[PDB]
């Protein structure tokens with residue numbers, strides 16, 4: 001069964017902005033999503049310090065980038081803490097209502113879209129380059145869920161029946177037709193080296209057939 005939810009008004013407004021503002025420096029989406037994955041990895045690492053059984057669902061802590069030119073998707077996988085159903089519904093574990101307010105005021109006071117991550121809502125930068133985003137996640141305390149939104153004011157949550165993940169989060173970006181440069185291995189490596197050079201977890205860029 002699929003449950004459909006309305007976004008809180010502030011988040012709908014953040015998304016509509018991101019989608020409809022002119023802003024050429026779109027590559028920052030990948031920095032923000034890698035940063036989110038790094039934070040999720042830090043969280044499960046910290047919990048495992050006093051309860052090593054937290055890593056029974058997977059001891060490897062890493063980030064994988066998977067381009068797929070056939071489906072026009074870029075997938076970011078981490079083996080971090082994952083999200084419960086409650087986390088998903090509550091704006092993917094963010095304080096997005098208050099963060100959106102602070103971000104929109106910073107914009108009028110001379111901030112630009114690339115500072116989105118400082119306000120805790122960097123996930124939504126995915127919509128600079130994606131027509132739809134699918135999030136598959138598994139937390140130790142819950143089942144595997146799929147979240148999906150094409151913007152337009154709603155999101156869906158369902159129990160995921162695909163391949164089990166163990167623990168972590170898979171963010172699947174369905175790229176806009178004119179944003180396929182982010183499927184190119186050269187372009188991805190340029191962005192990672194420019195913006196994510198000092199992330200403290202291995203980042204593997206998968207190759208295509």
Ligand SMILES: CNc1ncnc2[nH]cnc12
Nearest residue numbers: 036037040082092123169
């Ligand atoms: C966006 N919120 C997230 N929460 C937990 N783990 C993640 N991995 C990537 N994004 C997240």
